[PDB]
C-alpha cells in the first residue's frame, strides 16, 4: 500500500525534475545558440517561468499527502566494475562504469562550504533575540499579512 504511494511519489517527482531539466537545458542552449537580440524581458520571462513553475511544483508535490522521505534510505546492492549498457540506457547518455566511485559521489549530503558558512552565519544570527520578540514578530507579521491579503481580496470584488 505505502510502497505504491512511494512509487507514485518517485514517478511524479522524477517527472517534475525532468521538466526542470528540460527547462534548464532549453534555457542554456537558448543562451548559447540564440545569444543575439536577447532582451531582458526574454530572460526575465524564462527565469520566472522556470523557477516559479518548477520550484513551486516541486514544493507542492513535496509537501502534500506524501510519505515521509526521511524514512526511506538509499542503499546499493551490487558493485560490479563492468560497462553495463543497460545502465547506460537507463540513466540517459551518462553514468560510466558502475564502480567504487559513483555511489560515493552521489550519496553526498554535505553541501558546498559557502552555504555551510551561510548556515554558520544563520546560527550566529540565531544567537540574537528569541522566543519573545521572535513569537511577537511571527504573530504580528502573520496578522498584518492576513490583513493586507484581506484588503486586496476585498478590493478585488
Amino acid at each position: 500500500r505505502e510502497e505504491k504511494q512511494l512509487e507514485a511519489s518517485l514517478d511524479a517527482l522524477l517527472s517534475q525534475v525532468a521538466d526542470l531539466k528540460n527547462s534548464l537545458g532549453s534555457f542554456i542552449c537558448k543562451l548559447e545558440n540564440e545569444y543575439g537580440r536577447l532582451t531582458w524581458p526574454s530572460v526575465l520571462d524564462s527565469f520566472a517561468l522556470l523557477s516559479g513553475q518548477l520550484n513551486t511544483l516541486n514544493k507542492v508535490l513535496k509537501h502534500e499527502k506524501t510519505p515521509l522521505f526521511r524514512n526511506q534510505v538509499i542503499i546499493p546492492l551490487v558493485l560490479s566494475p563492468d560497462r553495463d549498457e543497460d545502465l547506460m540506457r537507463q540513466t540517459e547518455g551518462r553514468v560510466p562504469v558502475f564502480s567504487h566511485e559513483v555511489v560515493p559521489d552521489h550519496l553526498r549530503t554535505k553541501p558546498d562550504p559557502e552555504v555551510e558558512e551561510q548556515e554558520k552565519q544563520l546560527t550566529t544570527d540565531a544567537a540574537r533575540i528569541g522566543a519573545d520578540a521572535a513569537q511577537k514578530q511571527i504573530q504580528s507579521l502573520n496578522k498584518m499579512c492576513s490583513n493586507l491579503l484581506e484588503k486586496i481580496s476585498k478590493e478585488e470584488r
Binding site: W40, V73, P104, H106, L107, R108, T109
Partner: protein
C-alpha cells in the same frame, strides 16, 4: 559529531585482513565515531559466546545485510526487543573498507535542490545587474535601391551570358 553523514572512518592496516566476520571486527577495533562503544556487541566481545549474545543481551545490534566478497559488505544497525524482533536504526555500507552511513531519501533531494536554488539565485542576481533601461531607448545591456535596378539587373544577366565567369 554534528553531521554524522559528512564523516568518513577507515583503518588502512586492517584492509588486507577482510573476511565476512572480519568486516564486523574491522567495525569494532575501536574509535569509530559511527559504531558505538556502548553497543551490546562490545559486551559480546568482552567475555565469550558470540553466537547468542546478540540475542540474549537485548538492545542495539549491528547486523550485516549483504555480502560481496571484495569490497561491499552492508552493515545495518537495529534495535531488538526480543528474539526475532528486528527494528531498523541506521545503515552503514562499506566500500573498500570505508564505511559510509546511508543517507535518507529526503536529505539528498533537499541538498541537491538547495544547490539548485543557490546556483540559479547567483545567476539571476548577476543577470539582473546587466540590464539597463530607459523609456526612450528601451532595454540594453551594460556591456537603398532606386527602382531603375530592374533594368540594370537585366543588363547584368546579359553581361553574365555575353561574358561568362572563368575560374
Amino acid at each position: 559529531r554534528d553531521n554524522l553523514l559528512g564523516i568518513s572512518w577507515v583503518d588502512s592496516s586492517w584492509i588486507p585482513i577482510l573476511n565476512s566476520g572480519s568486516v564486523l571486527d574491522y567495525f569494532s577495533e575501536r574509535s569509530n565515531p559511527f559504531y558505538d562503544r556502548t553497543c551490546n556487541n562490545e559486551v559480546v566481545k568482552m567475555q565469550r559466546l558470540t553466537l547468542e549474545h546478540l540475542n540474549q543481551m537485548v538492545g542495539i545490534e549491528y547486523i550485516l545485510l549483504h555480502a560481496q566478497e571484495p569490497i561491499l559488505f552492508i552493515i545495518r544497525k537495529q534495535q531488538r526487543q526480543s528474539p526475532a524482533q528486528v527494528i531498523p536504526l541506521a545503515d552503514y555500507y562499506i566500500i573498500a573498507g570505508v564505511i559510509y552511513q546511508a543517507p535518507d531519501l529526503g536529505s539528498v533531494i533537499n541538498s541537491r535542490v538547495l544547490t539548485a536554488v543557490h546556483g540559479i539565485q547567483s545567476a539571476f542576481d548577476e543577470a539582473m545587474s546587466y540590464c539597463r533601461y530607459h523609456p526612450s531607448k528601451g532595454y540594453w545591456w551594460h556591456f537603398s535601391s532606386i527602382f531603375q535596378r530592374q533594368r540594370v539587373d537585366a543588363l547584368l544577366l546579359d553581361l553574365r551570358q555575353k561574358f561568362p565567369p572563368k575560374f
